[PDB]
Design a protein around this ligand. Structure first.
Ligand code: SAH
Ligand code: 7JS
Ligand code: CL
Ligand code: MG
Length: 213
């Protein structure tokens, strides 16, 4: 098996079906005690939770799903009827994520789109009936953060107040994105210093709120 299949099986055997908090705890335990994996983790996850609670977004887009940890973490905090769309290019990972969401009981709140963000973003309005997004979690390959932000804006998917929350702005880092949003009058930015998942290494999140053109 793969590490991702091992994570899934661990959840299935050490968490309670339909209990998202138990799922998060099982993943965190496995990734602390057995094998590291690139989930946002509990340190940064607590900051994400605080942000989600503040904004109560009705429609969230996540870029990069992996095994579903962040999707579970966000979706468990959504209000009834609110929704998450998550984009995942790797079909093996998409299948893990779906199974993870199913086990957590969150499958009605989340749609996992199997494809590359740069191909799926232009389809959101017509194919997926999206008007504008309330929040975007950027956590895919770091070189896509700026191009996809710019694409989201081109596609008319951002509105005044759309919250972008970007993982890993220190490690691995996303220097072009960070410079761009911090220098642009179209974003109001805040840095949340934290730690790399499961590691004593500094990392951080950036929140960038879109202000319009
Ligand atoms: N352009 C792209 N579109 C969609 N998925 C992408 C992508 N570039 C990378 N990915 C995916 O981005 C993921 C990054 S890891 C995502 C971790 C997850 N957000 C969590 O915290 O639990 C990987 O699964 C990778 O396959
Ligand atoms: O949270 C993440 C962490 C890392 C990462 C990988 C190796 C390291 F040594 C340190 C950090 C990569 C990611 C790629 C995509 C989404 N998130 C990532
Ligand atoms: Cl952590
Ligand atoms: Mg990350």
């Amino acid at each position: 098996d793969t590490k991702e299949q091992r994570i899934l099986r661990y959840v299935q055997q050490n968490a309670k079906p339909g209990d998202p908090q138990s799922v998060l705890e099982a993943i965190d335990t496995y990734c602390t005690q057995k094998e590291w994996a690139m989930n946002v983790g509990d340190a940064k996850g607590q900051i994400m939770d605080a942000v989600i609670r503040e904004y109560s977004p009705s429609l969230v887009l996540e870029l990069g799903a992996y095994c579903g940890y962040s999707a579970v973490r966000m979706a468990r905090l959504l209000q009834p009827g609110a929704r998450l769309l998550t984009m995942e290019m790797n079909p093996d990972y998409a299948a893990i994520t779906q199974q993870m969401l199913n086990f957590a009981g969150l499958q009605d709140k989340v749609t996992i789109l199997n494809g590359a963000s740069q191909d799926l973003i232009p389809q959101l309005k017509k194919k997926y009936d999206v008007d504008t997004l309330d929040m975007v979690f950027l956590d895919h390959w770091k070189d896509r953060y700026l191009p996809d932000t710019l694409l989201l804006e081109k596609c008319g998917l951002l509105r005044k107040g759309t919250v972008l929350l970007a993982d890993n702005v220190i490690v691995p880092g996303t220097p072009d994105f960070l410079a761009y949003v911090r220098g642009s009058s179209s974003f109001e930015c805040t840095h949340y210093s934290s730690y790399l998942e499961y590691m004593k290494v500094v990392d951080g999140l950036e929140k960038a709120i879109y202000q319009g053109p």
